[PDB]
Amino acid sequence: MLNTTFANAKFANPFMNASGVHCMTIEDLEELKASQAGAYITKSSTLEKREGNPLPRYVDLELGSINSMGLPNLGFDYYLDYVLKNQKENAQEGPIFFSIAGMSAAENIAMLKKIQESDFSGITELNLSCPNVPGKPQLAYDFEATEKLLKEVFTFFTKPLGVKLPPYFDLVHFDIMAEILNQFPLTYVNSVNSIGNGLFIDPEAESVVIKPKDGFGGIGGAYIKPTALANVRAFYTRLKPEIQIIGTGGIETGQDAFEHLLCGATMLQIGTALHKEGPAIFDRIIKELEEIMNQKGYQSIADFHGKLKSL
Amino acid sequence: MLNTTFANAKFANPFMNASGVHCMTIEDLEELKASQAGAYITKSSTLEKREGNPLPRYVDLELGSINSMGLPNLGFDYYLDYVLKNQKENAQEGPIFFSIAGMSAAENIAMLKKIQESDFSGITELNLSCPNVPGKPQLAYDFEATEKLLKEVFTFFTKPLGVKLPPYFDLVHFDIMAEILNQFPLTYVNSVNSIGNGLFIDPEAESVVIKPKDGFGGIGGAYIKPTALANVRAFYTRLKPEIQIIGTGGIETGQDAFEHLLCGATMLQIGTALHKEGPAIFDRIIKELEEIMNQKGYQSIADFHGKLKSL
Numbered sequence: 323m324l325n326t327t328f329a330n331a332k333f334a335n336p337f338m339n340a341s342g343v344h345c346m347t348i349e350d351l352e353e354l355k356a357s358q359a360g361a362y363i364t365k366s367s368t369l370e371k372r373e374g375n376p377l378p379r380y381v382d383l384e385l386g387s388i389n390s391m392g393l394p395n396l397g398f399d400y401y402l403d404y405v406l407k408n409q410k411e412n413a414q415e416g417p418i419f420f421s422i423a424g425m426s427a428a429e430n431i432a433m434l435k436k437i438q439e440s441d442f443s444g445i446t447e448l449n450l451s452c453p454n455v456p457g458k459p460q461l462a463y464d465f466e467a468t469e470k471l472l473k474e475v476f477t478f479f480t481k482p483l484g485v486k487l488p489p490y491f492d493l494v495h496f497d498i499m500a501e502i503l504n505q506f507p508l509t510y511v512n513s514v515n516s517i518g519n520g521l522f523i524d525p526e527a528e529s530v531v532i533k534p535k536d537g538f539g540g541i542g543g544a545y546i547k548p549t550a551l552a553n554v555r556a557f558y559t560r561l562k563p564e565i566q567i568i569g570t571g572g573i574e575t576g577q578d579a580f581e582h583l584l585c586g587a588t589m590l591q592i593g594t595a596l597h598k599e600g601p602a603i604f605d606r607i608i609k610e611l612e613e614i615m616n617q618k619g620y621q622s623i624a625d626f627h628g629k630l631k632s633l
Numbered sequence: 634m635l636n637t638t639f640a641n642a643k644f645a646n647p648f649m650n651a652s653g654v655h656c657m658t659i660e661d662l663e664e665l666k667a668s669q670a671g672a673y674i675t676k677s678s679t680l681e682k683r684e685g686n687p688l689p690r691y692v693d694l695e696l697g698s699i700n701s702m703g704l705p706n707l708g709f710d711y712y713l714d715y716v717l718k719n720q721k722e723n724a725q726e727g728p729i730f731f732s733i734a735g736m737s738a739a740e741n742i743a744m745l746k747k748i749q750e751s752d753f754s755g756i757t758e759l760n761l762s763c764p765n766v767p768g769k770p771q772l773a774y775d776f777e778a779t780e781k782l783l784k785e786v787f788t789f790f791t792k793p794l795g796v797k798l799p800p801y802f803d804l805v806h807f808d809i810m811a812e813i814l815n816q817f818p819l820t821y822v823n824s825v826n827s828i829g830n831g832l833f834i835d836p837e838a839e840s841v842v843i844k845p846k847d848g849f850g851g852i853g854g855a856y857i858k859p860t861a862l863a864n865v866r867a868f869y870t871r872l873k874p875e876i877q878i879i880g881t882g883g884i885e886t887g888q889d890a891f892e893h894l895l896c897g898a899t900m901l902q903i904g905t906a907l908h909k910e911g912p913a914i915f916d917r918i919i920k921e922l923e924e925i926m927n928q929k930g931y932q933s934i935a936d937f938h939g940k941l942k943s944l
C-alpha cells in the first residue's frame with residue numbers, strides 16, 4: 323500500500339525520522355534500519371565534533387516540544403564513514419539520507435565537495451534553517467545568500483540534493499523561493515524545520531524551561547502542523563515537478579500523515595513524536611495510514627497524493 | 634489587583650478584545666463596554682466599507698482557529714463617528730482604541746490625517762500585519778517599507794500611536810525592527826497578529842475548511858502562544874521603555890495572561906478565546922489571574938511584570 327518512489331529510488335513506505343531525532347550515533351541509526359521506517363536520515367553534521375548547547379535543551383510539551391540543541395553531532399567524517407560502510411552491505415531498500423548543516427557557507431561547500439568526491443550514492447540534505455545556533459540567522463530567510471550559495475553548489479555537486487527549509491508565512495516568500503529553487507537540478511525540498519525562536523514558560527517557577535538563548539527554542543509537534551501543511555502545499559503548487567517534497571511537521575497519527583500526502587508530500591519525516599515514542603512509532607503510524615486508506619478504498623498513495631480539494 | 638497604567642492612561646485591568654473579534658458593529662462595541670474588559674478596540678478599518686472574503690472564512694479548531702476574513706468592516710467614517718460620540722459621554726475608565734489597516738500606505742496616511750485633524754483623544758493602532766487580504770503582503774515583513782511609512786506618519790501624527798505586528802521567528806528580525814521602532818515617539822507595539830498562512834484540512838472530505846485563498850488562513854489560539862510569548866519577550870528586552878507592549882496570542886486562562894505579563898506585556902488582547910466564549914470571558918479570566926496572584930501573594934502586576942527568569 324505505501325510503496326513510494328522518490329528521487330528515482332524505491333522505498334517500502336514514505337516514513338522517516340526527521341534529522342536531529344534518533345539519529346546521533348551509529349546505534350541510533352541501526353535502530354532506525356531495524357524499524358519499519360521506509361527510510362532514515364543522519365543528524366545534521368558540521369565539519370568538526372560539537373558538544374552543542376548547555377542543558378536543559380529539549381523539553382516535551384503537551385502540544386509538542388521545544389529545543390535548542392545547538393547542533394550536537396559526532397562530526398562529518400563519522401557520519402560519512404557510517405553511510406559508506408552501510409551501502410556496501412546492501413542491507414536495506416533504498417538509500418540513506420545524509421544531512422549537513424555547516425556553520426558557514428564555506429563549511430557547507432567543503433562538506434559538499436567531500437560527498438561528491440566520495441563513493442556515497444545516497445541522498446544529501448543541505449540544512450539551511452538551523453535556528454538553535456547563537457549568532458547564525460537561518461540562511462533560508464536571506465534570499466540573496468540562499469541563491470548565491472546554491473549557484474555555487476550546483477557548479478560541482480551532481481549527486482541527489484535536497485534542502486531543509488524553515489517555515490514561511492507570507493505567500494510572496496513562497497514565490498521568491500520557488501523562483502530560486504526552480505532554476506536548479508534539486509531533487510527535493512523538505513518543509514518544515516522548527517517554528518523558530520518560540521518561548522515556553524513554567525508559570526510556577528516563573529521561568530523559561532531551556533537554558534540556551536534565554537529559553538528561546540524551535541517549536542515542533544501539533545503546534546506547527548498548520549504551518550507545515552501550508553508550507554508543503556504552497557511549494558507543491560509552485561515547484562517544478564522534478565523537485566519533489568518531504569513533508570515534516572506535526573506528524574503523529576495516520577491522519578496527520580494523510581494530510582501531508584494530500585498536500586503533495588512524497589516522503590514524511592517524524593521528529594517530536596518519534597522522540598517521545600521511539601522507533602516503534604513507524605509500525606503504529608503505518609497501520610493507521612493503511613486503515614484510513616482501506617476505509618476510503620484506496621490501495622496506493624497515488625489515489626490521493628496531492629489531491630487536497632479547495633472549496 | 635489588576636489596575637494598570639498604559640499610554641499615560643489608567644485602566645481597571647489589562648484585558649481587551651483583540652481587533653477583529655467582537656468589535657465590528659456599534660452593538661458589538663457596546664457589549665465590550667458593558668463587559669469587564671479593562672479596555673477595547675475597534676475592528677481594523679479601511680477608507681471604504683468592505684464585505685470581506687467569501688464564506689466560510691472562520692473556523693473553530695480544537696487548538697485554536699483559522700480565518701481569512703478579508704478585512705470586513707463598516708468603514709473608517711463609521712468607527713470614527715462612534716468613538717467621537719463615545720468620549721463625549723465619559724462613560725468608561727480609559728480611552729477606546731481605534732484600529733486602522735489601510736490597503737495601501739497612502740490609505741493609512743489619509744486615515745491617520747483624518748484622526749489627527751479630528752478631536753479623537755484615544756489610542757490609535759496601525760495594523761501593519763493583516764495576512765488575509767489577497768495580493769497584499771504583511772508590510773511589517775518588509776523593513777524598508779515599514780520604516781518609510783513610519784517616518785512619513787511621524788512628520789504629522791502627534792497623538793498616541795501603536796503598531797500591530799506580525800510574528801517574527803529570527804532574532805535578527807527582532808533587532809532590525811527594534812532599531813526602526815526606537816527612532817519614533819511610538820506609544821506601543823502589539824505582538825502578535827495571527828500566524829500567517831497556515832492551512833487546516835478536513836481529512837474525511839479531503840479539503841480545506843475555508844474558501845478564500847485555497848484554505849490558507851491566519852492561525853490563532855493555543856497553536857501560537859509560544860510564538861506570541863517569544864515576540865512579546867523579545868521586543869521587551871529590545872524596545873526603549875517609552876514604547877510599551879500589548880501581548881496578543883493564545884490567551885485563554887489566567888495562566889496564559891500571567892505568562893504574557895511576565896514577558897513584559899502591559900495590556901493583553903484576547904481573540905480566538907473571546908470569539909468562542911463571548912464577553913463573559915473577561916470576568917472569568919480576571920478571576921483566574923487574581924487567584925494566581927493570591928496563591929503567590931502578589932497584590933499588584935508590578936510584582937512580576939517583566940520578571941521572566943532565564944535558567
Ligand SMILES: Cc1cc2nc3c(=O)[nH]c(=O)nc-3n(C[C@H](O)[C@H](O)[C@H](O)COP(=O)(O)O)c2cc1C
Nearest residue numbers: 340341342366514515516542543571572592593594
Ligand atoms: C531534538 C531536535 C533536534 C533537531 N535537530 C535537527 C537537525 O539536526 N537538523 C534538521 O534539519 N532538523 C532538526 N530538527 C527539526 C526536525 O527535523 C523537524 O523539522 C521539526 O522537529 C518539526 O518536526 P516535528 O513537528 O515532527 O517535530 C530537530 C528537532 C528536534 C526535535
Ligand SMILES: Cc1cc2nc3c(=O)[nH]c(=O)nc-3n(C[C@H](O)[C@H](O)[C@H](O)COP(=O)(O)O)c2cc1C
Nearest residue numbers: 651652653677825826827853854882883903904905
Ligand atoms: C476573526 C479574526 C479577525 C481578525 N481581525 C483582525 C484585524 O481586524 N486587525 C488586527 O490587528 N487583528 C485581527 N485579528 C488578529 C487578532 O487580533 C489576534 O492578533 C490573533 O487572533 C491572535 O490572538 P488569539 O490567539 O487570541 O486569537 C483577527 C483575528 C481573527 C480571529
Ligand SMILES: [Mg+2]
Nearest residue numbers: 355356357358
Ligand atoms: Mg527497516
Ligand SMILES: [Mg+2]
Nearest residue numbers: 666667668669
Ligand atoms: Mg466595562
